[PDB]
Amino acid sequence: KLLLANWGLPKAVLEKYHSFGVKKMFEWQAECLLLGQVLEGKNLVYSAPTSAGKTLVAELLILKRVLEMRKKALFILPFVSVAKEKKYYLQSLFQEVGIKVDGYMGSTSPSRHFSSLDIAVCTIERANGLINRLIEENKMDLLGMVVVDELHMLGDSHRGYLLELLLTKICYITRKSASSNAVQIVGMSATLPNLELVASWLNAELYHTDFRPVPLLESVKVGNSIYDSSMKLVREFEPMLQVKGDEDHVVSLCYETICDNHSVLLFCPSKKWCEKLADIIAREFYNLHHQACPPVILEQKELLEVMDQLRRLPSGLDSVLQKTVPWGVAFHHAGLTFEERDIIEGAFRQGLIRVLAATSTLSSGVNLPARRVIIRTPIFGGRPLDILTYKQMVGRAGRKGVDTVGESILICKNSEKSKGIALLQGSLKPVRSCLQRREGEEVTGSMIRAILEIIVGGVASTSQDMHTYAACTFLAASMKVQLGAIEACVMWLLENEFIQSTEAGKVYHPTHLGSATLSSSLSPADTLDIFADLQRAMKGFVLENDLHILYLVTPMFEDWTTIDWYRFFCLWEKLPTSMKRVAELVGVEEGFLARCVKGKVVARTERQHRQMAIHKRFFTSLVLLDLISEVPLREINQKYGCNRGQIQSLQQSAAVYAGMITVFSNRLGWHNMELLLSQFQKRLTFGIQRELCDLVRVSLLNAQRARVLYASGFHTVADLARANIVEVEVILKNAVPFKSARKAVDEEEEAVEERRNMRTIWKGLTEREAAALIVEEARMILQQDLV
Amino acid sequence: KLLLANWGLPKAVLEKYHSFGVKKMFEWQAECLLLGQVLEGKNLVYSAPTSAGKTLVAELLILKRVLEMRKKALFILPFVSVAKEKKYYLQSLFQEVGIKVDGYMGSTSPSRHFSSLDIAVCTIERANGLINRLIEENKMDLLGMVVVDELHMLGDSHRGYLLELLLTKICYITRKSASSNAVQIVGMSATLPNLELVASWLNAELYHTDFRPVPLLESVKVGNSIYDSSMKLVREFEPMLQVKGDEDHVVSLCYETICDNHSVLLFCPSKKWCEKLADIIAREFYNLHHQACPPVILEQKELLEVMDQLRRLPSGLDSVLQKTVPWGVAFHHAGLTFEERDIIEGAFRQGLIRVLAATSTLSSGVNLPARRVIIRTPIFGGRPLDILTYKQMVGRAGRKGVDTVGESILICKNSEKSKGIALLQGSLKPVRSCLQRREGEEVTGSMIRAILEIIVGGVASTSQDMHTYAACTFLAASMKVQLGAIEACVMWLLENEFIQSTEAGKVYHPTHLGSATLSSSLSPADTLDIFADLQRAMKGFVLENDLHILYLVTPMFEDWTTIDWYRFFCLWEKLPTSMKRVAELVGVEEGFLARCVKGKVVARTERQHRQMAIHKRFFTSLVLLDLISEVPLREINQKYGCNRGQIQSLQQSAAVYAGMITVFSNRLGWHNMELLLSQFQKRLTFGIQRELCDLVRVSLLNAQRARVLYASGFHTVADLARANIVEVEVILKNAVPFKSARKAVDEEEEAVEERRNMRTIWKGLTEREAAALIVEEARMILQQDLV
DNA sequence: TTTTTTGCCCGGG
DNA sequence: CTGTGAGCTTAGCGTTAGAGTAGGTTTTTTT
């Protein structure tokens, strides 16, 4: 029965599973795969805890369908991190049968067009983008299957409502062609009260189970007392350690199980709070070792390899990590460089680290199981802790093979107790659409996009079809205004020129501003703020410097950071007129910055909303300029107050926004603006090729400078030590694009001073000085390397 | 001796000469080829009257050397019309031997890279341009021969001094290398004085003849009395058909030779005076036949075919050609189209036209003999006629031995008789080099080109090698201020950033602006303006429309027309609000336009020297904007005060200026601005697409408005007659680049009106109405073709 | 109160 | 928005910011 070898897998995949793990399925998996019609081809929704073999029940369906029918699966995952991990995992299983597995995730994408793949594993908005493009190609018939994780995100508005739109399009196009399942939807979720509604919407079969291989003792600590689920008072605890201001004994709650050689995962409200607790915990591991209780075992021979591997990173070994990592204490949050996450994840996954204070980043996207989970408060960011967040936090408790029973302890004040009791006793709110109009309110951005994305694809081009599409949404299940809201959208789309009216009844056609908003996969709420920037550049584009191209290209964010408007006003005042003119043409204005330094965010009329959206995008441009200007990432974080983890997210985004907005300007037909961006797409790439890595040892070589030496002479630093200073000076003078020292007639001097100060090679040296000093540096580097 | 077959020509060329020419040389041709060292590879400078077989000597020397030395030869010719004719001759002559003959002239380029050619037939600046690039590619060793026509041109300031700069380079690059010739030079110089000096400068043989196949009977008329050049009276004239319509009775002097039934040619100081006087003469041939020496034999059947060929002209038959051409009278201007000029010449070349009136456009650039030449006055323009122009006029008398003698008649009133006679009794002034200076004067721009070009090409870079170059000039040869002239050049080229000074004498290197000058082959004095326009565009470029890029690629002229400043000032206010913004950024201003309306004469400081060039260029940009906007030339002429010759020169020059300024911008490193210009150069062309030609012809559709139909549905006229009006309406809506109809916030209402106007057609049709009308015209005219 | 003339790399079948 | 303990700093008791997350066509290969 449960032994997987009986299920008829091809031996290569069976042997790969035998290598990867258990040969026998859990009983719930055998039931769920033996519902009456899921194997026939009917859609499915199911739920199991994250500790269960959740994805196996999809993988065996994928393996069957892609082998039994020569059609292409589309595996939709909530985050790039889990998408990358699942890509490599699934590649390892199927590759010996010849299934081509590749993914759309972050900046990475398949080296071949979708028609060559067999299983595309991708993030949600990559999948919706691919669905839009499959519609534009009308090649949708290729799509065999959609596998959806976290289907309970149907109601999440920041991201997730895309899952309504995406599944609705597949239903509608199937129903449009209908009026043996063409596209099977397999939807994985946490258990919901109305899960059978989602299953009924998807016409799906249903399974859900409480089964988990490792059981969880949930609890709330209040005072000394620990209450089990159903508030059974199982235990009282007394402080094994006495610590100044550890009024909750949070260190002792760690130490108690550290005495048992078991690890602790400690979720906190914020990054600052994680650093403070990783500091405090490491100080007590130090004190216990210094005042030398049971002994503490560390295997520091391994921690020195981890901590040296951190020292190699251009971040440097962070001042907190210097203190904590030697003791097996770490911290983990999205302020860390991706490599620092992967190092600290790996060190905790092997258990070299024993305590890891973390934000929600270890709740979603990072599967670090632990014996004991702790949640430092019921309040997060002044919210009550979300019930979905809590039940995803505690799902980390228990380690499959290393441990027998999982433990979790919420820490709660006596006055807060009702909130903790609610978190344990409560259950997830019923999932409900974002399409639903609130009774008296303006129609929602999810509905506006949901209507635009069919019209622009040439699907449901007449309004009677739009009512037929609305009847496919999950909203049309949640209600059992449904007609009147649709014609309130087309008014908004018409009066913003996303679509055109045509008589005969009527037919609606996409404008270029339609096709651009669709095929760049921007949101309609963004392409107004982008178009008001792109079109205003057509009226006067500064070509002598990058800042205006960066303002068009820089990612849209709201509150990318807390912004110091006063330092931004001090910064804007300092800009060169070469660049301050770009601020004027963009519309940055002293009358607006003066308000934003003097007072609150302006009340948002459409004018004041636009003028606010301009400045936050400009501030993000000045950061993004400094990144390409090779200003030290240590300096940038002083200058703008962001931190190194945000910068890598900005680098990841700006490299993509250059690509989107090129397609946006292409679809508008503004080909003369496209080329000015399609060239800049070559320069938003921040990692050097190995060509310069030797030359980059020379302190006077910016990569922009090493670029011309290697292009001119293939130089090894030995060659730069051999080179004649006169040849370097001429190579330097033939490196920079020509910019006069001459003042032209009716110029202001500041506009040419900034042409002169832009040619000195650091302010900085003149080339006659630099070309001597760089040969003297190179010959010193050479003799230091040869010894 | 003189029988050509004895000279050892290859039979293919010999038979081609037997076909095209005659089997014998003239006496002077043999005597010159028998100059002992010439056939050994000595340089030669020779003269023969232009009606003799001047070029046969040069052609025979090329043919021999390319067979024997087997090195590539460069044939330099004064004008593109002369170059094209001599290209087809040399190609048709040599190609049966397999000599790869092609050339560089006008917008033309050879079908393969230079090294593929055996002969390059070339205009002066395509040759001096080529010589610069052979030095950059260091292929100078390839150049085995240079052959030069009109070597007397060295004294022109506007042009042709390049023929000193080129030959001085070849001399210097020989003598510096050497201290059987490295290059053989053959120069033709039309019987100058000081011709021994030119021969001595090139270290060449001197050869001269006055031989003519038919003698020139010069004469001069005052009153009724005609005098020989010796001022003997030859005749008193009898003005048959006496009329007050010509107070000098030149109509009778034309009719006289017309009674001899031979062609006559008349040179006139002005287009309108030419155009008037052709009408006057034609109405007397009308008067003869309407009254009826015999009447003029008209052969009207051929003239009606010629006149129908003018009716077939895209610009239609000129009403003045309706008057004159049926009588065998025509006129000839730079103001005609080039097609009309070629047609009218050909009709005269076949002798169908028997009288032709011209400006100097028949002095130089073409050779069409006429038995009698008439010169209307000793005064041409505001000044006495140049004796060089007189000789090239009267040289037209020899009808290729189809007639036994040639005639010339200078005509004047009783005043200035001596200054008239001085054209007959005078001879060419001494040739000289415009590299010469006054003491109270700047070093001339032709010297600045010389001493710049050596530096930038990477030759003679040392401060003493330039004085070694100057010793090879024809200036220095003529002198056997000049020592300071080279130092004045280097100071001027430093202050204009064309060169860089490096220490340890000193060694000078090109800037990018140096190499950009030479690579574009612009003048230094032009490049100060073409750069300042580009440098100003970098500070704020209007991508919104075509006008601001046209201002950069607008051909730069002095007085390409008189500018009717009041009509231009009216045409300035009529510019749309976006185009009136371009006028701000380039610096067009009412405070200058109104001042040119107020008064023609202005003083000029450096500000005013730029301001004139800005406006004179901008006015020419407006003409280009209309020409790409498909405005009818019938309007443009009347709108700007322009004619169909000036327009045609501006089209043919603009296609080259967008070429040069790509290569100018590319090598300044402004690769963003380069790609805009390189993109726009793909639009700045005026040919007709093969497949669209009939579609644009029949339906009266603008080229892009038809092209998108062929792109969107491949319609022929027979298919557009079937097109659905709603489908065409949707195409008409989405064919254009997106211009939003909505006003933005923070925008002038007078600005958005433009963007909504741009989508209208012309009148002022809606897209609905145009999409109806276009289908009606297609389906109606389909029937008119089928009937 | 007014004459004629020239420059550039690159693609095509 | 909501909240609270962290933050500022000389001292020893003043004053508040605060989670994580993502979209593009061409292109893959070197001096």
Ordered DSSP codes for A253-285: HHHHHHTTT--EEEE-SSHHHHHHHHHHHHHHH
Chain center to CA of A626? 22
Distance CA A242, CA B109 (A): 92
Q: Which two tokens stand for residue A641?
A: 């107050």
Q: Which two tokens stand for residue B374?
A: 């008439």
The verdict on whether residue A10 carries a ligand-binding annotation is no
The pairing of strands B219-222 and B119-123 is unpaired
CB neighbour class for B181 (10 Å; exposed up to 12, middle 13-18, buried from 19): middle
Query: Residues A192, A303: one domain?
Result: no
- For residue A637, is it within any domain? yes
Distance CA A350, CA A5 (A): 31
Query: How many CA atoms within 13 Å lie on the side-chain side of B292?
Result: 11
> Count of CB atoms within 10 A of residue A526's CB?
14
CB neighbour class for A272 (10 Å; exposed up to 12, middle 13-18, buried from 19): exposed
Q: Is B150 left (phi over 0), alpha (psi -120 to 50) or beta?
A: left
B-chain CB neighbours of A673 within 8 Å are 543
Domain span holding position B255: 216-425
Q: Are B582 and B544 in contact (CB under 8 A)?
A: no
- Which residue, among B317, B271, B287, has the nearest Cα to B643 in the 3D structure? B271
Q: Are B701 and A473 in contact (CB under 8 A)?
A: no
CATH number of the domain residue A570 falls in: 1.10.3380.20
Q: Report the amino acid identity of residue A566.
A: Y
Q: Helix, strand or coil for residue B678?
A: helix
- Which residue, among A728, A560, A585, A533, has the nearest Cα to B581 in the 3D structure? A585
Q: Which two tokens stand for residue B329?
A: 């009278």
The verdict on whether residue A29 carries a ligand-binding annotation is yes
What contacts B508, CB < 8 A, 6 or more positions away?
B455, B461, B463, B490, B499, B500, B501, B502
Q: Are B640 and B622 in contact (CB under 8 A)?
A: yes
Distance CA A392, CA A512 (A): 43
- Cα dihedral A215, A221, A224, A225 sign: negative
Q: Which residue of chain A has the CA closest to B516?
A: A738
Query: Residues A110, A12: one domain?
Result: yes
Q: Report the amino acid identity of residue B269.
A: P
CATH number of the domain residue A325 falls in: 3.40.50.300
Q: Report the amino acid identity of residue B671.
A: H
- For residue A188, is it within any domain? yes
- For residue A111, is it within any domain? yes
The verdict on whether residue A51 carries a ligand-binding annotation is yes
Distance CA A247, CA A259 (A): 20
> Count of CB atoms within 10 A of residue A769's CB?
13
Distance CA B707, CA A146 (A): 43
Q: Helix, strand or coil for residue A189?
A: strand
Q: How many helices (H) and strands (E) does chain A have?
A: 33, 20
Q: Report the amino acid identity of residue B513.
A: L
| CA–CA distances in Å: residue A341 to residues A303, A645, B29 | 16, 10, 91
B741 reaches A (C-beta below 8 A):
yes
H helix or E strand, kind and range, residue A530: helix A524-538
Residue with tokens 């050909």: B346
Distance CA B9, CA B25 (A): 13
Q: Which two tokens stand for residue B307?
A: 């006149």
Phi and psi dihedrals of A281, rounded to 5?
Answer: -65, -45
Inter-chain CB proximity A539 and B539 less than 8 Å = no
Distance CA A737, CA B91 (A): 43
Out of B639, B657, B680, a domain closes at: B680
Distance CA A137, CA A458 (A): 11
Q: Are A359 and A381 in contact (CB under 8 A)?
A: no
Distance CA A138, CA A263 (A): 53
- For residue B102, is it within any domain? yes
Q: Helix, strand or coil for residue B770?
A: helix
Distance CA B528, CA B522 (A): 10
Q: Are B240 and B246 in contact (CB under 8 A)?
A: no
| CA–CA distances in Å: residue B87 to residues B54, B73, B76, B543 | 16, 13, 11, 42
Query: Residues B232, B359: one domain?
Result: yes
Inter-chain CB proximity A502 and B726 less than 8 Å = yes
Distance CA B312, CA B337 (A): 13
Query: Residues B269, B287: one domain?
Result: yes
Query: Residues A487, A374: one domain?
Result: no
- Which residue, among B739, B651, B661, has the nearest Cα to B687 in the 3D structure? B651
- For residue A512, is it within any domain? no
| CA–CA distances in Å: residue B305 to residues B281, B324, B326, B336, B340 | 21, 14, 10, 19, 14
Q: Helix, strand or coil for residue B144?
A: strand
Query: Residues A462, A565: one domain?
Result: no
Distance CA B720, CA B709 (A): 9
Distance CA A329, CA A340 (A): 14
| CA–CA distances in Å: residue A494 to residues A461, A504, A605, A752, B569 | 14, 17, 21, 48, 41
Phi and psi dihedrals of A351, rounded to 5?
Answer: 75, 15
CB neighbour class for A35 (10 Å; exposed up to 12, middle 13-18, buried from 19): middle
Question: B186 pairs with which residues across the strands?
Answer: B44, B147
Chain center to CA of A784? 43
- Which residue is the nearest neighbor of D30, CA to C1'? A691
| CA–CA distances in Å: residue A403 to residues A19, A216, A253, A261 | 21, 12, 18, 11
CB neighbour class for B116 (10 Å; exposed up to 12, middle 13-18, buried from 19): exposed
Residue with tokens 């009109």: B150
Q: Are A44 and A203 in contact (CB under 8 A)?
A: no
Residue with tokens 């899952």: A163
Out of A185, A208, A231, a domain closes at: A208
CB < 8 Å & 24+ apart, contacts of A626-632: A627/A651, A627/A686, A628/A546, A628/A550, A628/A683, A628/A684, A628/A686, A630/A702, A630/A703, A630/A704
Query: Residues B630, B756: one domain?
Result: no
Q: Which of A610, A672, A683, A767 to mutate to test the interface with B (most CBs of B within 10 A)?
A: A672
DSSP letters of A632-653?
-HHHHHHHH---HHHHHHHHHH
Distance from the Cα of A508 to chain B's closest Cα (Å) equals: 11
> Count of CB atoms within 10 A of residue A413's CB?
15
- For residue B470, is it within any domain? yes
Q: Are A178 and A189 in contact (CB under 8 A)?
A: no
Distance CA B734, CA B730 (A): 6
B455 reaches A (C-beta below 8 A):
no
Q: Which two tokens stand for residue B443?
A: 């070093």
DSSP letters of A689-735?
PGGGTTGGGSTT--HHHHHHHHHHH---HHHHHHS-HHHHHHHHHTT
Query: How many CA atoms within 13 Å lie on the side-chain side of A455?
Result: 33
Q: Helix, strand or coil for residue B265?
A: strand
Inter-chain CB proximity A544 and B539 less than 8 Å = yes
Q: Are A127 and A74 in contact (CB under 8 A)?
A: yes
CB contacts under 8 A, A 475-514 vs B, are 496-497, 500, 502, 509, 511-513
CB contacts under 8 A, A 508-547 vs B, are 509, 511-513, 516, 531-532, 535-544
- Cα dihedral B772, B773, B778, B782 sign: positive
Q: Are B425 and B228 in contact (CB under 8 A)?
A: no
CB neighbour class for A475 (10 Å; exposed up to 12, middle 13-18, buried from 19): buried
Q: Which two tokens stand for residue B187?
A: 């120069």
Ranges of H-type helices in A539-630: 547-553, 565-574, 577-586, 590-598, 606-628
Q: Which residue of chain A has the CA closest to B498?
A: A740
For B358-425, give the secondary structure using H, E and C.
ECHHHCCCCCCCCCEEEECCCEECCEECCHHHHHHHHHHHCCCCCCCCEEEEEEECCCCHHHHHHHHH
Structure-determination technique: cryo-EM
Q: Which two tokens stand for residue A702?
A: 């910016």
Residue B111 DSSP symbol: S
Q: Are B572 and B583 in contact (CB under 8 A)?
A: yes
The pairing of strands A499-503 and A225-228 is unpaired
Q: Which residue of chain A has the CA closest to B528?
A: A744
The pairing of strands A119-123 and A101-104 is parallel
Distance CA A366, CA A267 (A): 13
Distance CA A57, CA B344 (A): 89
What contacts A625, CB < 8 A, 6 or more positions away?
A546, A547, A550
- Which residue, among B377, B384, B427, has the nearest Cα to B221 in the 3D structure? B377
DSSP letters of B411-479?
EE-STTHHHHHHHHH--PPPP--TT---TTSPPPHHHHHHHHHHHHHTSS-BTTHHHHHHTTSHHHHHT
CA(B115)–C1'(D26) in Å? 36
| CA–CA distances in Å: residue B192 to residues B29, B45, B47, B208, B230 | 18, 11, 8, 10, 21
DSSP letters of B181-244?
-SSEEEEE-TT-TTHHHHHHHTTEEEEE----SS-EE-EEEETTEEEETT--EEEE---TT--T
The CA dihedral of A569, A571, A573, A577, to the nearest 10 degrees, is -140
Residue A600 DSSP symbol: S
Inter-chain CB proximity A497 and B740 less than 8 Å = yes
A734 reaches B (C-beta below 8 A):
yes
Distance CA A14, CA B457 (A): 72
Q: Which two tokens stand for residue A122?
A: 């991708």
- For residue B435, is it within any domain? no
B-chain CB neighbours of A587 within 8 Å are 746
Out of B208, B227, B243, a domain closes at: B208
CA(A358)–C1'(D1) in Å? 25
Q: Which residue of chain A has the CA closest to B679?
A: A672
A-chain CB neighbours of B541 within 8 Å are 540-543
| Declared resolution, Å | 3.6
Q: Are A240 and A256 in contact (CB under 8 A)?
A: yes
- For residue B430, is it within any domain? no
Residue with tokens 């009939």: B694
Query: Residues B39, B155: one domain?
Result: yes
- Which residue, among A407, A330, A402, has the nearest Cα to A372 in the 3D structure? A407
Q: Helix, strand or coil for residue A502?
A: strand
Distance CA A407, CA A234 (A): 13
- Which residue, among A362, A365, A423, has the nearest Cα to A396 in the 3D structure? A362
B148 reaches A (C-beta below 8 A):
no
Q: Are B705 and B720 in contact (CB under 8 A)?
A: no
Distance CA A122, CA A78 (A): 8
- Helices B524-537 and B646-666 sit at what angle, rounded to 10 degrees? 70
CB neighbour class for A602 (10 Å; exposed up to 12, middle 13-18, buried from 19): middle
What contacts A30, CB < 8 A, 6 or more positions away?
A1, A2
Query: Residues B181, B71: one domain?
Result: yes
Residue with tokens 């069976």: A14
Distance CA A16, CA A365 (A): 25
Q: Are B81 and B224 in contact (CB under 8 A)?
A: no
The verdict on whether residue B81 carries a ligand-binding annotation is no
Query: Residues A327, A375: one domain?
Result: yes
Query: How many CA atoms within 13 Å lie on the side-chain side of A518?
Result: 28
Chain center to CA of B180? 36
Q: Is A458 left (phi over 0), alpha (psi -120 to 50) or beta?
A: left
Residue A327 DSSP symbol: G
Q: Is A24 left (phi over 0), alpha (psi -120 to 50) or beta?
A: beta
Residue B149 DSSP symbol: S
The verdict on whether residue A55 carries a ligand-binding annotation is yes
From A532, A539, A736, residue closest to B542, measured CB to CB: A539
Q: Are B509 and B497 in contact (CB under 8 A)?
A: no
Q: Which residue of chain B has the CA closest to A580?
A: B539
The verdict on whether residue A52 carries a ligand-binding annotation is yes
End-to-end Cα spacing for chain A: 68
What contacts A239, CB < 8 A, 6 or more positions away?
A246, A249, A252
Helix then strand then coil, % of chain B, to nearest 5: 50, 10, 35
**Domain count across chain B:** 5
- Which residue, among B653, B646, B638, B732, has the nearest Cα to B686 in the 3D structure? B653
Q: How many helices (H) and strands (E) does chain B have?
A: 34, 20
Query: Residues B369, B491: one domain?
Result: no
Query: Residues B416, B309: one domain?
Result: yes
- Which residue, among A190, A372, A341, has the nearest Cα to A263 in the 3D structure? A372
Inter-chain CB proximity B746 and A513 less than 8 Å = no
- Which residue, among B149, B197, B143, has the nearest Cα to B173 in the 3D structure? B143
